[PDB]
Amino acid sequence: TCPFYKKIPGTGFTVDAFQYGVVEGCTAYFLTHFHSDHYAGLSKHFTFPVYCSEITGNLLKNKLHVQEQYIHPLPLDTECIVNGVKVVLLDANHCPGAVMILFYLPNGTVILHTGDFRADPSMERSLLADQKVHMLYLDTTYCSPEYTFPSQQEVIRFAINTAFEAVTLNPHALVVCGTYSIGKEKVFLAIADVLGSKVGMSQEKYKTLQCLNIPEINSLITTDMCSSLVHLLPMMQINFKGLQSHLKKCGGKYNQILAFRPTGWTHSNKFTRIADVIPQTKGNISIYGIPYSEHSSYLEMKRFVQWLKPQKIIPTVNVGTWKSRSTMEKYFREWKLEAGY
Numbered sequence: 001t002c003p004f005y006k007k008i009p010g011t012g013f014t015v016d017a018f019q020y021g022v023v024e025g026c027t028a029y030f031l032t033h034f035h036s037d038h039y040a041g042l043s044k045h046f047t048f049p050v051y052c053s054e055i056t057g058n059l060l061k062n063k064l065h066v067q068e069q070y071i072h073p074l075p076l077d078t079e080c081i082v083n084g085v086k087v088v089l090l091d092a093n094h095c096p097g098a099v100m101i102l103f104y105l106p107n108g109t110v111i112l113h114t115g116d117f118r119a120d121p122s123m124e125r126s127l128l129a130d131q132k133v134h135m136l137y138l139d140t141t142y143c144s145p146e147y148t149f150p151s152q153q154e155v156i157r158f159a160i161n162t163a164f165e166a167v168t169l170n171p172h173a174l175v176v177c178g179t180y181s182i183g184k185e186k187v188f189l190a191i192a193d194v195l196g197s198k199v200g201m202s203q204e205k206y207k208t209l210q211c212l213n214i215p216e217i218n219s220l221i222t223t224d225m226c227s228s229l230v231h232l233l234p235m236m237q238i239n240f241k242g243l244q245s246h247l248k249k250c251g252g253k254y255n256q257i258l259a260f261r262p263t264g265w266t267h268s269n270k271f272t273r274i275a276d277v278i279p280q281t282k283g284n285i286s287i288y289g290i291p292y293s294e295h296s297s298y299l300e301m302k303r304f305v306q307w308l309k310p311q312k313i314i315p316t317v318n319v320g321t322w323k324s325r326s327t328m329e330k331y332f333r334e335w336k337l338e339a340g341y
Ligand code: NI
Pocket: 033, 035, 094, 116
């Protein structure tokens, strides 16, 4: 049945709760972002209202074929009213169209649901700053001190340098980038831009990317694989057989692949700096696994919470095991003690 941590008390609302059937008491279903663990169960036959960002609404229409009468898109950073309750959508710094949700309850309680997010000090200057938050529903994916990762900017620098050097040395090398959901677009767009190429991809993926309000996107992506020296592939194909196979399909246009798998974390981060990352290589194929995270590091998360000072924290990730839960509660307490709330 729907877990408690997907229900907003004192409203008829749920968040990211589409795989339980009709939830008893729910009048409006919010969707934070277009990732399959969160939308799971939405389809063209869904007949209740769905409240979301404009980009997420483009995706439900065009990718899931949800009928339009049921899609309720809202602007960001704007006070809106849903079934009598003031709400605000905030940029989550996750994937395109991902939002955090502010609920202002009739009784005076204020609730922030982060969805999936990568905390950043820029959030400390939105509409969050203007009033107190009583309850925080927190994206705790990496809520343990071992999880340190570099800035997104440092990771893209590494990728752009590496790609530029490989193709300048061998103009017949192809760059391949793995993907399996929206998000991490800067990886493949930043590399394409340094090489003066478009990114070539499947028709399906191309459609997806046209949903995202990306400025100048027609100048950046294509379905013609021949014209382009950065290709996007299903992540599942980012290995030596999958890449040799793809190289065979290019018909002697290329003689080397450099591939990037943008992974979340990899325990190589507990020993190795970004400058000190190395590929797995076999013959004329090299694969780099790069720690491009769209979730908070442990330190980023801690700073955000110590700044916000919520009265109660409700974890939404890693809640399935008693040892995980108990470990997160002990950190929350350390954070509160350290800061005096
Ligand atoms: Ni996500």
